[PDB]
Amino acid sequence: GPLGSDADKNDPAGKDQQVNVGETPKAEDSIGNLPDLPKGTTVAFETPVDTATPGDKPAKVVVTYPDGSKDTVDVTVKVVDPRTDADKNDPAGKDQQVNVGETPKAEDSIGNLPDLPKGTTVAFETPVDTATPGDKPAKVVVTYPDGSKDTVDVTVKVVDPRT
C-alpha cells in the first residue's frame, strides 16, 4: 500500500529528569534515544510542566518526525525544593516558668507550633534540672518532617512557690 511513516519506523524512549521548584524542564532531557530517531525530529511537552510545587509530575512528550507523523511518550518530571523545612521555617522560642521539681515540656518552650509544618517535633537537647530555683539555659531541637533540624536557645525559669 503506502511506504511507511517515520512514526511507523521509530519508537522514542521515555526518560525521567529532575528539576528545582521554579525551574522549567526541557523535553529533550525527557527523551533517551533522540539520536536513534531521524534527523530533524522535534520534541515538545504536550502540557507545559508545573514546577511551582515539589513532587513527581506526570508529562507527555510529543515527538514530531520530519514527515509530520507523531509519537507521544509518557514521562515523570521530578520537582524538588532546594530549600529544607529548616530554611522554610523559624521557630519562635518561648521562655517558660516552672516550680521546683516540675518537668518542663519542650512544646511549652516553642510558641509558633502551628506555623511549623504538620508532623514537626520538639524536644530538649538535654533534660532541664529543676531541683533548685533559677534561670536554666536550654536548647529545643526542632525536628522537621523532611528530616532537617533547627535548634532554639531558651531559658527555663525555676521558682520556689513558698517565696
Author numbering: 225 to 387
What are the paper's exact sentences on this?
Rib domains are often found tandemly arrayed; thus, to examine the interdomain orientation, the structure of a 2-domain Rib construct (Rib2R) (residues 230 to 387) was solved. The interdomain linker is short and consists of the residues DPRT. The similarity of the Tm of RibR and Rib2R is consistent with the lack of a large stabilizing interdomain interface. Importantly, both particles display very similar RgC values (8.7 Å, RibR; 8.5 Å, Rib2R), suggesting that Rib2R forms an elongated molecule represented by 2 RibR molecules stacked end-on-end. To further assess the interdomain orientation, we performed molecular dynamics (MD) simulations of fully solvated Rib2R at room temperature (303 K). The rmsd from the crystal structure fluctuates by up to 10 Å while that of the individual domains varies by ∼2 Å, showing that the mutual arrangement of the domains fluctuates in time around the crystal structure. Remarkably, the 2-domain structure remains extended on average, with an end-to-end distance of 96.2 ± 9.5 Å, which is consistent with both the Dmax calculated from SAXS (97 Å) and the length of the crystal structure (98 Å). Modeling of the 3 interdomain rotation angles suggests that, while a wide range of long axis (x) rotations (α) are accommodated, rotations around the y and z axes (β, γ) occupy a more narrow distribution. Given the lack of interdomain stabilization in Rib2R, rigidity in the interdomain linker is likely to be influential in maintaining the interdomain interface. The most common linker length between tandem Rib domains is shorter at just 2 residues, which suggests that most tandem Rib domains will be more constrained than in Rib2R and thus are likely to also form relatively rigid, extended arrays.
